[PDB]
Amino acid sequence: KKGDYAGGAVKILDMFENGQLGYPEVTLKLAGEEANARRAGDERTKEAIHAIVKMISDAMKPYRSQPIPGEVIAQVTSNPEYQQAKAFLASPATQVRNIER
Ligand SMILES: [Cl-]
Ligand SMILES: [Cl-]
Ligand SMILES: [Cl-]
């Protein structure tokens, strides 16, 4: 609910994986959550979103609005660091921490 920027990021990430979002829409939207997290002092949430934004940006470099290529979705979602960051943002502890702030 209110102030749950981690949860909001996970919703964006789910849309990214479904092909629903394009580039740079996905990173601009994640950056928005990341700024919300920064303003609220959800420091770990900010950092997790930042790591994901970097991964997506980097994977899009060879492809420099547009839909995300299937190859990029596959590469990113297969990256263990991405999986860890998304799970962290999705985790109860993180979401509660965000709501409590
Ligand atoms: Cl946090
Ligand atoms: Cl912070
Ligand atoms: Cl990747």
Separation of CA 74 and ligand 2 centre (Å): 30
Resolution (A): 1.7
CA–CA gap between residue 50 and residue 69 (Å, rounded): 21
Q: How far is CA 75 from the centre of its chain?
A: 15
Name the closest ligand to CA 72. Answer: 3
Name the E strands within the chain.
22-23, 66-67
Contact (CB, 8 A) for 94 and 5: no
Structural domain boundaries, residue 35: 1-101
Number of domains in the chain: 1
* For ion ligand 3, residues whose CB falls within 5 Å: 55, 59, 75-76, 79
- Domain containing 90 — which CATH number? 1.20.120.950
**Angle at CA of residue 37, ends 33 and 38, nearest 5°:** 115
